[PDB]
């Protein structure tokens, strides 16, 4: 039997006997993602070049507007916005959403894969909604996932019931369920990080990468892949296994990726898929944020691979 | 004035006062590329999953390119990554061109939605003999046209001819390649290097030294950033657009490299050269290698000329 | 604020505090309509003509499979199938659906507008589902409407809250609400029927049509339009006002159009729009069917026009 | 073997050993039609209705105008949308005159009736500076003509010396696929098409002819009637299924209603190349010598037996 994202989400919502607010949220997000996909694939660019005589801004506007008009949210955090957006009282629902509307867009000029990252929290207090409502550990996530605009467009959705992958069929504008209850390989064969920063590496990262190229147990050296677009690199890690690292460097003593709308959602996707996500010192999802745009280092992926990194990290204390 | 691929090729062809065969070939290829793009983006996948109650993407791509080229009446010999022997076009449909292509490069990892691409190189049949596989045994220096389609965040066709390199964005709303970047040139020196560093234990000593110099610059310059998608079209395009260097060099386990000369290396070398870049095997220009086997491999280092020259300096230093 | 079909239906469902089965039904139906639209616009026809070296059956299969897989239906009546389709027990829900999956398809060779017509009933008895659960008068309809595959694709959805029109944006595959709570003109200026068969007209039809062409007073004659596709002619009647006739005659004393999946859905839409729909002797929606494929005469459209027709009809009765 | 619009046209041009200007014009027209189809099907309408927080006939006109100018193949353009002939700037002048209706039937698009684009292509005949007069040629002089129908699917119908060919737009890939080669219309059909709402104004010849279709004097089967009210849709059905299409003069339109330059002549040319007929009653449409770019004509067109039958009645009434 075929299944779509909205039908899948409605069935789960009707099972849980919820109010329907989360379903409305996820449906609105789905609409926004289809619109972002259409723009990313350059539908209508001929009009820009004069047939009849931006992108990260448009993406942000699409997610902002669809989430506001969902009547399901009260606080919105975007990579694109300096302060938290507070929804007007008339359109408020109970959820907080942190999102990166077009991750990797800085390199979109070379048509690299790009993506949308989102994480959903329930507002916990009876206080007036404020920026601090988004300062929750990733453990509190109700849902998270990403849309990858790669060779094809796919939405990966993680909830308590696990991780599910939906392929956007552009012929009919429907997300089709193609991978149910996804789990990541226990051990991979690919490591993913920017080795251009080798001079700035923590000794623990240096040692670990050396182990990937020169295995101590006579196994084959790992392959290296680094797209430089987080959603693309993390998705490949989910599908084929292995390990993704964005550790600290000289420019980024707290890492470079953003905790709320980059690290936490992927960490949630990884953990719900049987993977792991760590800063080195603790689980990503256990970090308690104090600033909506704060950075965190992240090592994530297949559990054996992450544990091997953490084994190395602890050796260097 | 807006400009499209087919219109651009027609005007350049009318300038050259050619017979129109090359225009017909390229327009047929453009149709195949649009069809490959549609299938790659998974149009119609709902039917595969039972919405109404099947070929692999690289087989479909090959069939699409094969059929459109045969029916263009502009070709006589077709070399595909997918086929052991060159395909000889039927006599009724023969034209004067030989085309070597990789119909869907990078498809082995397509399960993770990595960018993939189509690569092509176009030669004129040089001999008066009846067409045969030997007609594809030409150095890249003989290319008439070459280029690639990148199926990335958007679909783009990069086309190289004597007049230079031009980039066309596929507008999927209307099925037209729109000219968006004219007479494209690569940066003289870049800041990114691209190769699979996981196989470092097998590196040639010159490759080890150069990569070390990019990470630990001896002259107090900034270290280069690293990017490696692992799909040749994606890495080559990023190299073209942002500058830098792409390497799949020879090593101890692979003394001739891994990438294929006819339908991977030569077209990408041709594009680099028309854009002011460089492409070498280490020993010589990729376009100067004289192939002896249509599926032979060649090592390739390509990209910004300053970066490639710096690599050859290290390579010659280690003899 | 933008509004889509599934979001519209969800909010209406949350107001009614239903179980969500109807919402799942309508979302499933919407998915089928987008797929029918894509096929009707001939997406992928290049493959049929050899680029790499029926339509009403596909449409029927699309609606059938989406409705079965919704877990919302138990009996399905289709123009394409001799007998009622009984949903297997594991997939049974509470609704009965009557539909014409591709109406007007007999003339699709000329690319004439085509459409999908549907009517949704609540199963009334606890008996085992059977053909008899579809023998309900149109008065019992829960929802009805049609999809028009014309210059653009539009879904017209009629419920208790009135008639609403949704335009398919094929760039993103979303039905966008473009006309809310539509009402038909009290009186129109267009009559619609096949005048080529005038020799067999009932004398009342002959008189009424003559009055449209040769008005007894100083008014303008009505214009004539007859697409020959019921969905197209009925939609124009809804949009511009006027009257559409497929009446009974001596050779066809029960009309030609089918009650369950042509007349009743359109009659329901007309009545929710402030229009009228009659067989000549009674309202279409009051006919109690005895056969899932039974025919009915139908005259529908603007109320002043349908009443004027009934004046003439009663004169010859 | 598969064939596309551009490939078909190129092959015909290489056979004719022409300069390539007509191929370029037709390729430019094909692009504009695909863009018109996309807008007609409402791609991107969600943005108009606020998803992120031109009228179609104006847009259609801009698409055709801009694509034709930039083709470098035209010198004078007549559009239903423009009061005067548009003269191409000298740098972009080519040898062809094009008369077109960029979105015919758009007045009823609110009900999603099929709409279409109609075009007729002439070679500029005089050596004078390009002017509005270059479009005042009889349809007999047409080099190419046709239409795109935005119906259930989008189809481009193209008539040239080699006959009539029909290309279906595949929206998945944006390619017109040749699906019906060298099309001919049925010698006699079973459908007549006209707005009988003007029955009180009909000349006796039309009234009599229509009576014969409904009540045939030989007691054969009566014709069925179809009238979409969008000319491209009605003429296309007439081409595909045979029969007869009529728009005669009436009191509101004593010179007929349809436009000679960019409605009657192109359809007349397609009909004639398909083995059909197209008449004003008095003469062949293609023989009318126009004096005004927006002038109207009565038109009766379709299957040859059916139009000849109309003309017998017409002559009977003098
Ligand atoms: O959507 C609903 N309920 C619902 C939906 C329909 Br249709 C009809 C009746 N009820 N509840 S929810 O809280 O939004 C939720 C969504 C997803 C998940 Cl996994 C859990 C909870
Ligand atoms: O197509 C033509 N000529 C041509 C085309 C038309 Br339409 C009308 C008249 N002439 N010549 S060609 O040899 O194919 C060629 C194409 C591109 C380039 Cl860059 C060079 C050569
Ligand atoms: O969907 C629901 N309820 C619902 C939905 C959510 Br979300 C959360 C809670 N309840 N009810 S329904 O029976 O499907 C229905 C649909 C449309 C209409 Cl007009 C009436 C009834
Ligand atoms: O296009 C050409 N020639 C042409 C085309 C290519 Br490709 C390569 C070389 N020459 N000539 S044309 O005048 O445009 C024409 C088009 C269609 C028809 Cl039926 C007749 C005449």
Automatic annotation (TrEMBL), chain B:
UniProt similarity note: Belongs to the FBPase class 1 family.
Cofactor(s) named in the record: Mg(2+)
EC number: 3.1.3.11
Keywords for the protein's UniProt record, in alphabetical order: Acetylation, Allosteric enzyme, Carbohydrate metabolism, Gluconeogenesis, Hydrolase, Magnesium, Metal-binding, Nucleotide-binding, Phosphoprotein
Positions of beta-D-fructose 1,6-bisphosphate binding: 105-107, 196, 199, 227-228, 232, 248, 258, 260
Keyword Membrane: no
Function, as annotated: Catalyzes the hydrolysis of fructose 1,6-bisphosphate to fructose 6-phosphate in the presence of divalent cations, acting as a rate-limiting enzyme in gluconeogenesis. Plays a role in regulating glucose sensing and insulin secretion of pancreatic beta-cells. Appears to modulate glycerol gluconeogenesis in liver. Important regulator of appetite and adiposity; increased expression of the protein in liver after nutrient excess increases circulating satiety hormones and reduces appetite-stimulating neuropeptides and thus seems to provide a feedback mechanism to limit weight gain.
Associated pathway: Carbohydrate biosynthesis; gluconeogenesis
Listed name of the protein: Fructose-1,6-bisphosphatase 1
A GO term, aspect molecular function: metal ion binding
Residues given in the record as Mg(2+) 1 binding sites: 81, 102, 104
HAMAP family attached to this UniProt entry: FBPase_class1
Domain Fructose-1-6-bisphosphatase class I N-terminal: 4-181
Binding-site list for Mg(2+) 2: 81, 102, 105, 264
Coiled-coil features, chain-numbered ranges: none
Swiss-Prot/TrEMBL GO biological process terms: gluconeogenesis
Keyword Hydrolase: yes
PROSITE patterns: FBPASE
Reactions this protein catalyses: beta-D-fructose 1,6-bisphosphate + H2O = beta-D-fructose 6-phosphate + phosphate
Subunit structure: Homotetramer.
Ranges for domain Fructose-1-6-bisphosphatase class 1 C-terminal: 186-315
Ligand binding (AMP): 9, 19-23, 96-97
Pfam families according to UniProt: FBPase, FBPase_C
């Amino acid at each position: 039997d075929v299944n779509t994202l909205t039908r899948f989400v409605m069935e789960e919502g009707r099972k849980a006997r919820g109010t329907g607010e989360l379903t409305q949220l996820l449906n609105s997000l789905c609409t926004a993602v289809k619109a972002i996909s259409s723009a990313v694939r350059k539908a209508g660019i001929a009009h820009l070049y004069g047939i009849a005589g931006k992108l990260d801004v448009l993406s942000n506007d699409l997610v902002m507007n669809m989430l506001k008009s969902s009547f399901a949210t009260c606080v919105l955090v975007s990579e694109e916005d300096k302060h938290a957006i507070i929804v007007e009282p008339e359109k408020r629902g109970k959820y907080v959403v942190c999102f990166d509307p077009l991750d990797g867009s800085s390199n979109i000029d070379c048509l690299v894969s790009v993506g949308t990252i989102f994480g959903i929290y329930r507002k916990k207090s009876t206080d007036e909604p404020s920026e601090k409502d988004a300062l929750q550990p990733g453990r509190n996530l109700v849902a998270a996932g990403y849309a990858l605009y790669g060779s094809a467009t796919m939405l990966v959705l993680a909830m308590d019931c696990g991780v599910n992958c939906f392929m956007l069929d552009p012929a009919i504008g429907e997300f089709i369920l193609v991978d149910k209850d996804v789990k990541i390989k226990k051990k991979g064969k690919i490591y993913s990080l920017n080795e251009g920063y080798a001079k700035d590496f923590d000794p623990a990262v240096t040692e670990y990468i050396q182990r990937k190229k020169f295995p101590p147990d006579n196994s084959a050296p790992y392959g290296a892949r680094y797209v430089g677009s987080m959603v693309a690199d993390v998705h490949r890690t989910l599908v084929y296994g292995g390990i993704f690292l964005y550790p600290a460097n000289k420019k980024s003593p707290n890492g470079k990726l953003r905790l709320l709308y980059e690290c936490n959602p992927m960490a949630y996707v990884m953990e719900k898929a049987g993977g792991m996500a760590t800063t080195g010192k603790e689980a990503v999802l256990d970090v308690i944020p104090t600033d909506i745009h704060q950075r965190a280092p992240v090592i994530l992926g297949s559990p054996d691979d992450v544990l091997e990194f953490l084994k190395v990290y602890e050796k260097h204390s």
